[PDB]
Design a protein around this ligand. Sequence first.
Ligand code: NDP
Ligand code: NDP
Lengths: 320, 320
Amino acid sequence: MTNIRVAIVGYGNLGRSVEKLIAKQPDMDLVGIFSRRATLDTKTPVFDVADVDKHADDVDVLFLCMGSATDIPEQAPKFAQFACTVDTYDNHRDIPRHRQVMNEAATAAGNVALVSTGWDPGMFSINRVYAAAVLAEHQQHTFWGPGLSQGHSDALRRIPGVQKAVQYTLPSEDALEKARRGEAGDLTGKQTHKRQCFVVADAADHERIENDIRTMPDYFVGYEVEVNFIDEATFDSEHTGMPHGGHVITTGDTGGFNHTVEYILKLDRNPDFTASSQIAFGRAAHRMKQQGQSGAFTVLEVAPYLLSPENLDDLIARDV
Amino acid sequence: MTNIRVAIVGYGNLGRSVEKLIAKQPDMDLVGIFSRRATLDTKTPVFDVADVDKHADDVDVLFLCMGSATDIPEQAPKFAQFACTVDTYDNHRDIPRHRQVMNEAATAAGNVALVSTGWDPGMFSINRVYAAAVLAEHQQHTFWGPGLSQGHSDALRRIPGVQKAVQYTLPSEDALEKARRGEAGDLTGKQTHKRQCFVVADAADHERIENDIRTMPDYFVGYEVEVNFIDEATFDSEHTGMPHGGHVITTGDTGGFNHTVEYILKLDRNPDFTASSQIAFGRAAHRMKQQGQSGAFTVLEVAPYLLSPENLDDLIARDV
Ligand SMILES: NC(=O)C1=CN([C@@H]2O[C@H](COP(=O)(O)OP(=O)(O)OC[C@H]3O[C@@H](n4cnc5c(N)ncnc54)[C@H](OP(=O)(O)O)[C@@H]3O)[C@@H](O)[C@H]2O)C=CC1
Ligand SMILES: NC(=O)C1=CN([C@@H]2O[C@H](COP(=O)(O)OP(=O)(O)OC[C@H]3O[C@@H](n4cnc5c(N)ncnc54)[C@H](OP(=O)(O)O)[C@@H]3O)[C@@H](O)[C@H]2O)C=CC1
């Protein structure tokens, strides 16, 4: 009855999303939260992150939901000392090193570390690899969105006189249809997406701002940008969500015959879906260590059935 | 090391596609073809299927491209004795059994057999699994076509007195939409697809071919079926292409938020894509064997990176 004993390290949006979804898992028990703050908006027990050493045996897997930017790279390796570990670290350029270092740690403690799960990296990585592997010579693209970009939203905000603001990254529909036909080979980043800004600001300032936006080097110049100055009420009512999604499109030619494989995600709420993967890869981590494996692995190294709470035979009988 | 030695068994549409596509691979050498027929139009060496026996020592893996309806079930298991094998076996209700017997033959000879690969079963099965696992509470549907079903076409053709035949599968566009809006629940493939038959045969035989068709165990029973007896000309001109494809749709709700996972295939030539998938799993099979495994496995049981001609470090560096 496994009830694989889990805990959460870090209590932000993600951390909250994991907490809430564990109730819908048949086989997991939440043993509590490890936090750097004493007092959280919650009934699950809270512990001091420094005291993780002491709880070592109440826990099977630790979901690491702290920051990618600086926390993960430094804190994560020590945690693999105490249990299996799953993270959603999204810095592509650092993955190889993160894994290498996560690898020396987990191996020495005999734990299993799953790194860089989520939707991208995660689901979209898997799909990229599958479709590219299949379609020998192939053309591949990843579009993001439609969804929230915190980095672009932050740039907007630093603008003088902007009160509240958000920017969405949308895929250029033209650009999708073209990739679908194997014709998007010579297209730049400025052509593949479009940006849609929603700004709350005094009417006196609209012209300067809109100008400040469309000329913003590196963040905004070069794109199709659409700008809306909205009431604070419509802002709060409609632009307080965290949606996102994307497309992985791969094409290949087999001698005069085209094939297109498209993977699409539509998420009403980013950290909820990200929690969903992370949780599924947590179950896989536990099963992997149960089979005597150890070290760090990416989502590319785990057989699919491992994420499932159903028994293999049942999966083979119904879904194959 | 290094170049995998490979052979085809069954030289029909699939077998020809696999022939064509092996050229596109960097790490495979096609050693020959094993056929029940003496004269094949190809420059590849051909062999008597009764002679596999003698080539066991110089092939690392055998692609089984005989008919699922009748050939696979008794023939396959005997191939497992001589090398790794890879099939695209399609009778869902008979897969677990197939796997058992293939496992036994494989495990005995120390080989690896990969069963039921292709797109459905194959890629569609994998997608079904990742999505239902990730999203705890979900609704999931699959839709095939409009396109030409290879298994269904080969089935019709094994009915005595059928000179020529082809079958098209037609999905219900309405169902497809309700699905996208999480509203088609409690609907099945059998109620969402129509089966269309184009047949060439003497009018005298019409009565009994129609009976055999509509009473064809789970290849045809339970579906709405249409039988069209047409002139050879009309058939030879109007029914020549082999397109197909479909959609796997899954919808789920986290605490009051929705997510949709969509997987799509648009294939210009059915055998060509199927062949490309069968090939990548062939690479996986050979690797698992060197890696020390043996026995029969489903597509749910192989880590994605095993299908790729690239090194894992590169895959991780570039695609994750
Ligand atoms: N791979 C993927 O597809 C995806 C990956 N991610 C990754 O998820 C990571 C975490 O995201 P997210 O949860 O949204 O980030 P947050 O900023 O919400 O929280 C991160 C950390 O901040 C601390 N913290 C949170 N709230 C407060 C607060 N009010 N005051 C003080 N400290 C606080 C928490 O640590 P403590 O509890 O110790 O205070 C927490 O672990 C990101 O770095 C991201 O890259 C996200 C989506 C997708
Ligand atoms: N899992 C998946 O997604 C997919 C699986 N499939 C499977 O692939 C299978 C093969 O389909 P396909 O290649 O279209 O079928 P064919 O009718 O072309 O061939 C089947 C066998 O018939 C024999 N054959 C071929 N041509 C002739 C001929 N002219 N006269 C007499 N015998 C001949 C060949 O054996 P021999 O050389 O020994 O005579 C061949 O192996 C199907 O059963 C289908 O299930 C197809 C698509 C997808």
